[PDB]
């Protein structure tokens, strides 16, 4: 009827939610994880360095085989890198050079790409012609593309620069399901291991758990006080990390929907661009704006190690499904593999 | 050692050569960024260049390729995609001089100019200011005074004085006076002049960049 009642009802509901959260919060994860020995210092060496990009790199993804990875840069080129041999498997010339996101299909047959253009272009790699073409153009969005991650050979979940997230069908090329819960720009996107739920981060300093099939979100977390810049699901699938310009990493679980730990320090004052877990999830790796990368313990909140091989902002960070190595991309136009 | 991977290495070398050629071509190409409020003014500016998302325009002048990127239609928070324009040779800012009589619009344009000028990402890139609607501005000045949106304004009600005051107000917003230069200009109906001024500004900024690369600047 009027805001004077609906807003008050929403405020009372938020009050109830916060009261329930406080009641459920009995013991923090920090003091319950003191019984396990610290991981200790971790030293990682740059076994392989990939060069050939001539512009700032913004996103990269690891394939299912944990050997081939796709990288995107502002020069308008996608390079399929053979990490084992540093070979250039493919070079896709992008129609629009304004690209800041990319993805690799689980089957390895298609690779997604997008950016300031409103299209999450899909390219076919295993075609008989031997050349890479555009399988389809998904131009159903309004704002700038932020991240679209493959769900299957025919389904892809897309997050754009507007307040709405959408699910696309490759064969049909139409909006299968659109999510409008977010009230601000959407930046980060990650998928659960079971490919049934996904969490999208937005500039409203909140993260929402969305249902792929249901269509409506089930949880909302507002722990952060700044725009949500990065997000990644925990391997177990019951929790997910988060990076933000606040310069801290917050771990939220799906079941208790609390804020478990905050990874922060006085030295770090800049934002976090990308975050991802290891195979076991014990080590949390986050990319920072300064010329280095940091490894955070998922249970102790200690600086396990520093990866200072880059000289510019780190824009992406991915860990293989196998987990034998970690690839760190930055604005140096180079990709470095650490393990 | 390798038996079949040698062909893959040769293919990678060919791809690297193609990438190097494309990068050289891109470096030869000059990048320009278009910013400002009002679709009509930006449309007029782009149409004055003689040969959805971002609209990209390609044109050549004096054997120099020019790339112009349109971001007005993006309709997104600038704080998350303005860093992609780090390597832009120059930024063109277009404002309608008649916006002062429409609803406050001049204040919004000034705020946008201040935000862009003081952005950490554009601490070195030059900004070119294009003052649109010269005849319309003169008619509005002869009809309505400029003091409506400029309480501090105190001077003769003349087109030249009002234009000078507007230019001075726009320039003072540049905090990085030493590091950044503003090539303000007044748009004219006749063609071949706005493009000439853009080319001159690009030549000046390219000279600055070359001197800095050498070490003198």
């Amino acid at each position, epitope marked *: 009827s009027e805001l004077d009642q609906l807003r008050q009802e929403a405020e009372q509901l938020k009050n109830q939610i916060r009261d329930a959260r406080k009641a459920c919060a009995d013991a923090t994860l920090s003091q319950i994880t003191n019984n396990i020995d610290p991981v200790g210092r971790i030293q990682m060496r740059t076994r392989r360095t990939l060069r050939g990009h001539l512009a700032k790199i913004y996103a990269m993804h690891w394939g299912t085989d944990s050997r081939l990875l796709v990288s995107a840069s502002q020069d308008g080129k996608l390079i399929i890198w053979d990490s084992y041999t540093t070979n250039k498997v493919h070079a896709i010339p992008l129609r629009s050079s304004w690209v800041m996101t990319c993805a690799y299909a689980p089957s390895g047959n298609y690779v997604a790409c997008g950016g300031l253009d409103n299209i999450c272009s899909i390219y076919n790699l295993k075609t008989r*012609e*031997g050349n890479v073409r555009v399988s389809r153009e998904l131009a159903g969005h309004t704002g700038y593309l932020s991240c679209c991650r493959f769900l299957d050979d025919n389904q892809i979940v897309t997050s754009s620069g507007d307040t709405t997230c959408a699910l696309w069908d490759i064969e049909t090329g139409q909006q299968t399901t659109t999510f409008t819960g977010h009230t601000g720009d959407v930046m980060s996107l990650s998928l659960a291991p079971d490919t049934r739920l996904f969490v999208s981060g937005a500039c409203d300093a909140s993260a929402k758990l969305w249902d792929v099939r249901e269509g409506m979100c089930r949880q909302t977390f507002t722990g952060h006080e700044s725009d949500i810049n990065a997000i990644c699901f925990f391997p177990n699938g019951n929790a997910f990390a988060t990076g933000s310009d606040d310069a801290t990493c917050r771990l939220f679980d799906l079941r208790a929907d609390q804020e478990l730990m905050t990874y922060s320090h006085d030295n770090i004052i800049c934002g976090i661009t990308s975050v991802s877990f290891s195979k076991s999830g014990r080590l949390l790796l986050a990319g920072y704006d300064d010329f280095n990368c940091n490894v955070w313990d998922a249970l102790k909140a200690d600086r396990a190690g520093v990866l200072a091989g880059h000289d510019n902002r780190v824009s992406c960070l991915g860990v293989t499904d196998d987990g034998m190595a970690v690839a760190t991309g930055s604005w140096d136009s180079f990709l470095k593999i650490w393990n | 050692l390798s*038996a079949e991977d040698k*062909a893959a290495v040769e293919r990678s070398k*060919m791809i690297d050569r193609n990438l190097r050629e494309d990068g050289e071509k891109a470096a030869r190409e000059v990048k320009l960024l278009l910013l400002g409020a009002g679709e009509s003014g930006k449309s007029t500016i782009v149409k004055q260049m003689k040969i959805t998302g971002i609209v990209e325009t390609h044109f050549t002048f004096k054997d120099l390729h020019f790339k112009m990127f349109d971001v007005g239609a993006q309709r997104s928070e600038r704080k998350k995609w303005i860093h992609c324009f780090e390597g832009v040779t120059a930024i063109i800012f277009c404002v309608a001089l008649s916006d002062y009589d429409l609803v406050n619009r001049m204040h919004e344009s000034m705020k946008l100019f201040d935000s862009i000028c003081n952005n950490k990402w554009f601490t070195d890139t030059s900004i070119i200011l294009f003052l649109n609607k010269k005849d319309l501005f003169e008619e509005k000045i002869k009809k309505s005074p400029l003091t409506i949106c400029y309480p501090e304004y105190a001077g003769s009600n003349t087109y030249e004085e009002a234009a000078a005051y507007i230019q001075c107000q726009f320039e003072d917003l540049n905090k990085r006076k030493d590091t950044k230069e503003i090539y303000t200009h007044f748009t004219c109906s006749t063609d071949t002049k706005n493009v000439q001024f853009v080319f001159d500004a690009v030549t000046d900024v390219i000279i600055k960049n070359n001197l800095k690369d050498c070490g003198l600047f």
Partner: single-chain antibody
Amino acid sequence: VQLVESGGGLVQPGGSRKLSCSASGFAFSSFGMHWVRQAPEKGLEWVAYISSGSGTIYYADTVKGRFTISRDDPKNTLFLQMTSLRSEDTAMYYCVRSIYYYGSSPFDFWGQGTTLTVSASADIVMTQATSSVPVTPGESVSISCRSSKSLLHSNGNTYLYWFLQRPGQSPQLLIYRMSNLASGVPDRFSGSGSGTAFTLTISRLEAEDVGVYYCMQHLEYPLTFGAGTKLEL
């Protein structure tokens, strides 16, 4: 995808002919090319190869120097200039496409080929166990072969390929690296090996599987073929 070849006919001994092939439906520039000849009674034999970048041109020991191969990328055609032909040079030549990258399927497509009649060591051999095996529809048959040198490279990839040549048509690739099936190959086909002995199993035999089965080795470049096992229905 088509590969039309021309330049056959009766050739006097000691003469020179310019074989030409036209490539359409695929990126000729990005794909390497191989030339394979078939004796009237014997199996196929590799002749020459040219890479995508027109480099690393390799020849068989029996045509080294005598034969030269060139390609025209803008023209989208392949050429094979052969000079000083001898009596044994007569054979049915084929044009073969190939690409090389992780997960690639070289020798996937074979040209139809044209007839060519002439008026009258240190290589890996493929010792095929059997030359003819009797088969019936709905049965399972096993084809085995032996290689002088183990094809298991240090990278863990075994360089073995299988080809099916139905009568009246060019051969087609069946399995590459004895662990992956080419496009259009029915899933019933399966192959396995221990790095030195290879066995090919064809379960649920069908009428269209009749023909003769050939093998490959790709560790050393002087590629050699197998004797060939004939399947009679």
